[PDB]
Amino acid sequence: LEDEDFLKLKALEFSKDIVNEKLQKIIVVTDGMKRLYEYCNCKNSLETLPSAANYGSLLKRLNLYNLDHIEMNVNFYELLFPLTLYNDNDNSDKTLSHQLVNYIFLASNYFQNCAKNFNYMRETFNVFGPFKQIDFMVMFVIKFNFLCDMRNFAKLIDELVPNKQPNMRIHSVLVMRDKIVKLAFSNLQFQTFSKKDKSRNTKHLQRLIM
Amino acid sequence: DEDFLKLKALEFSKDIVNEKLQKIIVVTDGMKRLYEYCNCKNSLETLPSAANYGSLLKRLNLYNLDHIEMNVNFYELLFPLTLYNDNDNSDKTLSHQLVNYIFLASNYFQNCAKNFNYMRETFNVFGPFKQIDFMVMFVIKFNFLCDMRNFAKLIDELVPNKQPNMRIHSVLVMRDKIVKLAFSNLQFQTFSKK
Amino acid sequence: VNRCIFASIVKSPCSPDAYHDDGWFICNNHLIKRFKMSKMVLPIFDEDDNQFKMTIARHLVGNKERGIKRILIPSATNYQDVFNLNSMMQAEQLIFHLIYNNENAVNTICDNLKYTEGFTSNTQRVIHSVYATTKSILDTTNPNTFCSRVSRDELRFFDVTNARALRGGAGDQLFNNYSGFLQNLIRRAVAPEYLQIDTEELRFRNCATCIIDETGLVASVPDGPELYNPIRSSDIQPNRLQIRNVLKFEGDTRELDRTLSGYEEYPTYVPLFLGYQIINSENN
Amino acid sequence: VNRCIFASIVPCSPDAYHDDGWFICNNHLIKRFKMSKMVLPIFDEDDNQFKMTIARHLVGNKERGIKRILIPSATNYQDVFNLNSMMQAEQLIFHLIYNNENAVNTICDNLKYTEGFTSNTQRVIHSVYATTKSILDTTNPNTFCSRVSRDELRFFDVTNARALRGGAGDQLFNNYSGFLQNLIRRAVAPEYLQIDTEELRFRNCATCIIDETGLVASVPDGPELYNPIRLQIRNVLKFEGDTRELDRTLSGYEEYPTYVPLFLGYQIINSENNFLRNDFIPRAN
Amino acid sequence: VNRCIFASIVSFDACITYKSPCSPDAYHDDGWFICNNHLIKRFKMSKMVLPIFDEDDNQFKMTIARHLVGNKERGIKRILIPSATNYQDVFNLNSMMQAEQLIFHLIYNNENAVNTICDNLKYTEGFTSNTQRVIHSVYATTKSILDTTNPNTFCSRVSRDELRFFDVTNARALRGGAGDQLFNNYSGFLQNLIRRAVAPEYLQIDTEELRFRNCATCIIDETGLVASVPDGPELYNPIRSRLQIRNVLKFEGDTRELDRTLSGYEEYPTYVPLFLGYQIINS
Ligand SMILES: [Zn+2]
Ligand SMILES: [Zn+2]
Ligand SMILES: [Zn+2]
């Protein structure tokens, strides 16, 4: 509540300094969104599953909002790969490789344990969140918490990094890890067992126009 | 041409919508001015009549919603129908056709992903300003969305069962897995600082 | 030992095949009798041994056949007309009536035989034993019931659309309504073009060969002219003269092949490809 | 007598000794184009016989692009024939075939630059050359009096045969060197044959689509069919060959060949049936 | 002498004779009263020992087991022990023989099932032979063990002479905690069984703490012991002993002489020992 003000600008500094996206394009740290985006205000932990006690007020906000809007897929390769295609000018490459790959596999194992343990998480949230949409809230919050800790990580690593030329040594295991994520979603049966009809049922397809 | 079965689907959806749970705010959605020019509703992607409306650049510039590297959850897109067939019981009244329709849609995604590797340039020939980099996936999704829009008219009065068909659900899983796998082949090749 | 239905029946010498393990309800001789086919196999495997050796069959439907003669196996509708069992033995008529569930005709036969002394004196044991045996053979499979004791649900599909027809497909209901051994024999006969492995999908031919009509299984091209069928003519009325026209070769120089004969050769028969198959990752 | 075109090598399998229009050993056909020399037998109701030449597809399923390519375009030839992996003789041969006179003369001077040529190995090398050269010379259909097809035409599309339509692929076939066209006509069995009085459809669908890039193996559509065959991975995927033995019956069942035959293009005979002039003349349309 | 409760199996009726008897270990004395045969047959573990120096050739040697479950099994397939809530549906006791069923009802204190069983016996020829007194002698054995266990053991160590925490050492392991207390719910017989099946992660002796593994292998469960990692993908189990897939992407290498060359070097066993809990011993 005392020192964010600098980073508020920092997240936008280099992006406003540059105008040169020519194929690959970023939402500028996505840095413009409603109170939900403004709520991510703490050094949460990426290492572990969320500290459910932290988020009760967030859940009570979410109760004002609908949640049948959420894709299951992480879009791991899709979103992350474009925002990594950049390097130093031929220096500290060891460093860059190390933090990049380590963060990569950290997110990998993070999602792997999320999928392996989603039941315990959603139930431990529901224990005090008896809300009818609590499962969608849990899924959303999982995504959003990951995204926010990622935004903080990005904010922190924000550096010159002008260089841009693919390293296929980096991009090789790209496919292996991303396809393991999608295989995790395949391993998610998504459990059609007589509960999702309580949803808006894909908004009845909105007159087949959405 | 007419709304026609649009109104019939509207009627059926009204018959299902006995509940509102309204006044909940939709922060997420900004679906400005959706338009439904998709009367060609073709099974296949080749139409220059789709590129006819390449002016989409203009509406993009006003409200972009660019979606890089777009990949689709076929499972989630098709799941809702899984419970609806059982307004009646004890027949494949439509499922006999739904299964093969699912096969066809999956095979479509198997093949158009291959054909994309050259069809981009045909669309640049349709319009040299292109920006096909995104519009190709745009149309790829949109045309099947139109297919679904008409397919719903082909099925009409179907209502949510509580009992799932394990066979159908397994079919959905086993097709969608490979469908998602197909996207793995998407790759980029030394564009430098683009 | 002999599993041929005609082996159950009571000259009509069976082929020796149906004496053997594979449990086909017909010897290969009587597979001629109305069915224009020979049973076949496809050695299939990974890169060693040979693992799966899936059965298939080739028909010998004549290229010049049309209509009924294009139908491979009549539907329960009009099978009686297609066959004209009146041309056949009462045993054969009974059997077909059983397979098609024409229990009404079964009743009519039993009514006829009841008052005959040849029925009571000798033939009743034949009729009843044969009947029981046949029905028991049906029940040996009948995967619709009985634990589905034979095989599984199998994850087979036949009704796959071609890419260009309407959103049609029907008459699997009829498929089911057919005595299940017919379904199982079709499973003997028809490879899918495609098989899902638990983790992989594999394709075996570029294009399908056969169609299912409400009238029956039909050997038809999906489009265009029928392929020429060189029916080998090695195997099968003289009461009345039988006529044919046939366009045939003429020419010399066949010795030219004397050298080429050493090369690899391609058998040219018409296997049946129709449908899809899968293997479950788990029987969830 | 041995007359594989790889007898030039300075070894071919025994089939090379047949004087037959393959003009290749199956050895070298495999080693460079991954196909196996075949004949299709054809029979009548009479049981009279005829035969057509074939060579089933053999290159692996999964690989893509140039890996699908069996024979590139002359425009793209080295992209397969990455000469610098390949022996000089091989390179020279292929250059000749593609009419690459530029490269021809380049190698011609390379002989001098190989200062070991002072040993006059050039005599042997060029004798082998001329030997080869002879073969192409004989293949040339353009030679004035060489005999040509009377009753016969071939096209590489149904419509191109049915109405003499200007197929661009057909044109590029024509633009190929005469030997290449010869080898194609030798190897390629049609989807269709018209006859002076009759027509025959061999399949409802072709095996492969071939394009300007070269001999393309690709299926027209859908997935490729199965094609069965140190710090590396044998990587074998293998299956439950449970051996629930059934050979006791199955030995009698006809075993379908597990192969990818060629059914490619539309042949026409539309004149007095006279085919059995059994000379491997260029026989051009 | 014979001690395996399953070696105590007997038939009330003349047909079956259970002719797959207990392993020799039934005659041995670990105080487990379980043939390793049955251990496999119903639980899928193999018992083992770790010797530990008493800083000397004097030693404390702790019995443990290894689970035998593969990487593919999930949920009920991975359950090793149930709750009394769910032993029935976990086991399909009806498929098990009536002596097995009644013995499990003894384990779960299901007096209702015991009563129904006796009420069924009232008319049985086993009741005519009064063979139920076989069950009552099994009860005598049990009650002796129980007066040696439930009053004793943990309760005795409420004297503070000893304590084991089954709680996960890592506080981040949110799935831990309350299960360590739920431990209290089970029959002390079972509690003894599990605690002597499972190695601690640490031992306190006031000389020094000892740490036996980096990170706990096992986890407490909501109904009964399950073969599961605390977190992450399951570690591979080389269990080493229908047309299904058999694919294994072997490395290409053909060399074999290297193996004969390397027989001289530690052939590291790959079993899954059970590490869980905090151990405290006085002195
Ligand atoms: Zn027979
Ligand atoms: Zn050769
Ligand atoms: Zn025992």
From Swiss-Prot, chain B:
This is Capsid-associated protein VP80. The keyword Transmembrane helix does not apply. Structural protein that plays a role in the packaging of nucleocapsids and in their egress from the nucleus toward the cell periphery. Its main location: host cell. The chain holds residues 475 to 668 of 691 of the full protein. It is found in: Host nucleus; Virion. Homodimer. Interacts with host nuclear F-actin. GO terms for biological process: exit of virus from host cell nucleus by nuclear egress. One of its GO terms (cellular component) is viral capsid. The gene is VP80. The keyword Transferase does not apply. Keywords: Capsid protein, DNA-binding, Host nucleus, Virion. One of its GO terms (molecular function) is DNA binding.
Curated annotation (Swiss-Prot), chain C:
The keyword Ion transport does not apply. Coiled coil: none annotated. GO terms for cellular component: host cell nuclear matrix; viral capsid; virion component. Keywords: Capsid protein, Late protein, Virion. InterPro entries: Baculo_VP39. Belongs to the baculoviridae major capsid protein family. Most abundant structural protein of the nucleocapsid produced during the infection cycle. The monomers are arranged in stacked rings around the nucleoprotein core. This is Major capsid protein. It comes from Autographa californica nuclear polyhedrosis virus (AcMNPV). The lineage of its organism: Viruses, Viruses incertae sedis, Naldaviricetes, Lefavirales, Baculoviridae.
